[PDB]
Design a protein around this ligand. Sequence first.
Ligand SMILES: *[C@@H]1O[C@H](CO)[C@@H](O)[C@H](O)[C@H]1NC(C)=O
Ligand SMILES: *[C@@H]1O[C@H](CO)[C@@H](O)[C@H](O)[C@H]1NC(C)=O
Lengths: 50, 99, 78
Amino acid sequence: SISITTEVMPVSMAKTSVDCNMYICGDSTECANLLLQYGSFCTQLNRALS
Amino acid sequence: DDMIAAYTAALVSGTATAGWTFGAGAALQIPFAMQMAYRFNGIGVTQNVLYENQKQIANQFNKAISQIQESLTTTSTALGKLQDVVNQNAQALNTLVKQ
Amino acid sequence: HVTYVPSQERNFTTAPAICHEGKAYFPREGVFVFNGTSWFITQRNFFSPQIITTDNTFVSGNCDVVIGIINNTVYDPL
Ligand SMILES: *[C@@H]1O[C@H](CO)[C@@H](O)[C@H](O)[C@H]1NC(C)=O
Ligand SMILES: *[C@@H]1O[C@H](CO)[C@@H](O)[C@H](O)[C@H]1NC(C)=O
């Protein structure tokens, strides 16, 4: 007999990105100035997502 | 690096003088043309196709080796999967200092 | 895992092909070996010498191309 069988395999997922400043502080200026003192967290995070 | 170079030299020397045998059991000697004839049988071609035109096959092998060594003394991105790895490690440590 | 390992090797001298009457003869599955008195054909993994016949050998070309040709007789059951 001749039989055909199906097999499903995932290949990719969704590409995502985040604005660190907009998520943490929003529109606040004071929060942004306080966020500048937490250096090299947002860059290290965008690099992983990219 | 000298130990790894010794390992790969031993591996190439065993391949050139023994064949497929020094991975299954012990090493068994065989001439290189007969080894190449066996591999030609392996890909589905008879032994004569090697044996009447062995000289042009040897010439093509030598030319391909000489073309590889030319292309290595040329620009980058040939070894780009290795260099990238090195860069990543260094980059991580730099962050851990600036942090 | 149960596996097969070859055990005791032995030296022979060999040729790529033999020449009977102006024709090159190549083995089908095996190698030509020289026992010390006669030339046989044998499989690579086990030593079982077989007499060279027309059955286990095929013909291609003349005896003026292959490097390492030798002179020997090919038996025919006739
Ligand atoms: C004959 O076989 C032995 C091992 O069985 C090997 O050491 C020796 O080198 C062989 N003879 C030749 C001439 O290679
Ligand atoms: C093969 O060689 C062995 C020893 O070298 C000898 O005893 C034997 O008779 C030979 N085979 C034949 C068919 O003569």
